[PDB]
């Protein structure tokens, strides 16, 4: 029933989770739970600097989380860096993420956007046909011999 409304994050939802971070911190301590949900609210902020902080917030929690807890935080980091134009940074988090869970399709499709975007702002070979061009006659050849190591 989590219907995604057409809006980033109302200042109330962003500060709402910040309020908890304040009361908990006021006690002189902060539960990692708030630290995790506090970065999400920022990672989805309308300001970029808020993400630069939301990304660091999780980056410090990863070493503090186990391998499974990291698989979740790793997922948010690839999404936060993916939008900050940083395509390779998010590509390192999404690629290693598969090294752990290759059966993750949501992690695979994201890799396409990151890798596909880079080719977009790089202009591919415009019209393509099977590849950049043909080849010096070489259909199969995946079982026959190879270049004869011998001059003439």
Identify the burial level of 94 via C-beta atoms within 10 angstroms of its C-beta, where 0-12 means exposed, 13-18 middle and 19 or more buried.
buried
Q: What is the DSSP letter of 121?
A: T
| 73 neighbors 35 (Cβ within 8 angstroms) | no
Enumerate the H helices of the chain as residue ranges. 11-26, 32-43, 48-64, 67-83, 87-100, 105-120
Which residue is associated with the tokens 């301590």?
A: 29
CA 26 to CA 28: how far, in whole Å? 5
**Dist. CA 55–CA 78, nearest whole Å:** 9
CB 110 within 8 A of CB 96: no
Q: Show the tokens assigned to 6.
A: 């057409």
Angstrom CA distances, 79 to 86, 122, 134, stand at 10, 21, 38
80 three-state secondary structure? helix
Domain assignments of the chain as residue spans, ordered by start? 1-152
Topology (CATH level 3) of domain 1-152: 1.25.40
Method: NMR
Sign of CA dihedral 72, 75, 81, 86: positive
Token digits of residue 7: 């809006």
Does residue 127 come out as left (phi exceeding 0), alpha (psi in the -120 to 50 range) or beta?
beta
């Amino acid at each position: 029933m989590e219907a995604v409304l057409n809006e980033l994050v109302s200042v109330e939802d962003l500060l709402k989770f910040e309020k908890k971070f304040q009361s908990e911190k006021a006690a002189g301590s902060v539960s990692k739970s708030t630290q995790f949900e506090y970065a999400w609210c920022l990672v989805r902020s309308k300001y970029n600097d808020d993400i630069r902080k939301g990304i660091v917030l999780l980056e410090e929690l990863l070493p503090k989380g186990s391998k499974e807890e990291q698989r979740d935080y790793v997922f948010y980091l690839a999404v936060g860096n993916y939008r900050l134009k940083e395509y390779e940074k998010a590509l390192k988090y999404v690629r290693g993420l598969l090294q752990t869970e290759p059966q993750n399709n949501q992690a695979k499709e994201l890799e396409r956007l990151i890798d596909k975007a880079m080719k977009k702002d790089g202009l591919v070979g415009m019209a393509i046909v099977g590849g950049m061009a043909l080849g010096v006659a070489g259909l199969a050849g995946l079982i026959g011999l190879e270049h004869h190591h011998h001059h003439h």
